[PDB]
Design a protein around this ligand. Structure first.
Ligand SMILES: Cc1cc2nc3c(=O)[nH]c(=O)nc-3n(C[C@H](O)[C@H](O)[C@H](O)COP(=O)(O)OP(=O)(O)OC[C@H]3O[C@@H](n4cnc5c(N)ncnc54)[C@H](O)[C@@H]3O)c2cc1C
Ligand SMILES: [Zn+2]
Length: 306
């Protein structure tokens, strides 16, 4: 809620207690779905927490921090006096004011983060804790966090490209709802959401995303399914970067027309492949770092990869 991003309103020393409204599995149950056996699990949940929007006045594009319960064995073993698990950040998935502008909740799209043969080797603490949440459970929350990855706060005529891998869809759920529905700003640009996931059933919120596309004309949904689609350029796996290339004219509308690219998801540093594809499109032959900083300087690139 309320515009103007605030950060670190809540920290480990003064956390925010949020109650679980819902935590539903978005992807097929393990063993079901396209992902084989080897190739681990892909268990992604939409977590809806009840929050006081006056206490937690988050902006879409920000992260919510979660402190998972318990002692961290690495910290006990290192003899820290800290010992509590460190915050894990999760992109907020819900629009600033919540769906329906109800100001009642916060949402997260959280993958089970495990290693995996296909059988579990190492279990992610916070992602699993979060995906294990039952209605009415209390989440220790931190933040809000981040003040870069944000939507325009004034009227915007520029085109916006949302570039997502997996859970990186999160900010763009809320961002798209906000831009198309909430109209906190007048948005007269085109949204292109490029959403990458390994399997079609590992893409989440698709009914909702396709629905936005059919309701608007303002909104284009493109998916890149890396283990089911080959790209036309080299026949390799389809990634959002290949979709970006396919969408050269839309990318050029953004490059030339003051629009924005938002890149969110994994793995860490995946924006590089995307940006350098945007760079090929622009015809710029400077260093990756020159082009990216230029774009960020121009407010035309926002990256949150992890
Ligand atoms: C700004 C930002 C936004 C984010 N947004 C989202 C989001 O929207 N949705 C989302 O799902 N995630 C998001 N993430 C990632 C999230 O914050 C966590 O990092 C993620 O959930 C994994 O945390 P974890 O506590 O579950 O795993 P951790 O316990 O911290 O470990 C990470 C990985 O290491 C493995 N591991 C554990 N022990 C070992 C060991 N012994 N040796 C080798 N490997 C080991 C685990 O299996 C796991 O796969 C975001 C991250 C950032 C920084
Ligand atoms: Zn609408």
């Amino acid at each position: 809620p309320t515009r103007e991003p605030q950060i670190n309103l809540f920290k480990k020393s003064n956390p925010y207690k949020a109650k679980v409204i819902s935590n539903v599995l978005l992807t097929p149950e393990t063993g079901t779905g396209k992902r084989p056996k080897k190739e681990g699990e892909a268990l992604v949940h939409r977590i809806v927490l009840a929050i006081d929007h006056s206490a937690y006045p988050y902006v879409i594009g920000q992260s919510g921090g979660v402190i998972p319960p318990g002692e961290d064995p690495e910290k006990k073993a290192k003899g820290l006096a800290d010992v509590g698990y460190t915050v894990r950040l999760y992109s907020i998935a819900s629009p600033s004011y919540s769906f329906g502008m109800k100001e009642d909740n916060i949402e997260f799209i959280i993958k089970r983060d495990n290693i995996y043969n296909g059988n579990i080797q190492f279990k992610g603490v916070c992602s699993n804790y979060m995906c294990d949440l039952k209605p009415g459970d209390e989440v220790t929350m931190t933040g809000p966090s981040g003040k870069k990855f944000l939507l325009p706060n004034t009227d915007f005529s520029g085109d916006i490209m949302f570039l997502a891998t997996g859970t990186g869809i999160a900010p763009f759920i809320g961002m798209s709802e906000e831009l198309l529905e909430h109209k906190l700003i007048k948005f007269t640009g085109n949204i292109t959401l490029v959403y990458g996931a390994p399997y079609s059933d590992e893409l989440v919120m698709m009914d909702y995303l396709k629905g936005l596309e059919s309701k608007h004309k303002n909104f284009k949904l493109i998916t890149a399914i890396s283990r089911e689609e080959k790209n036309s350029f080299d026949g390799g796996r389809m990634y959002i970067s290949h979709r970006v290339r396919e969408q050269a004219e839309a990318v050029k509308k953004i490059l030339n027309g003051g629009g924005r690219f938002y890149i969110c998801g994994g793995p860490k540093g995946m924006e590089k492949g995307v940006i350098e594809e945007i760079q090929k499109i622009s015809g710029n032959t400077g260093t990756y770092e020159e082009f990216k900083h230029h774009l960020e300087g121009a407010h035309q690139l926002f990256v949150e990869t992890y």
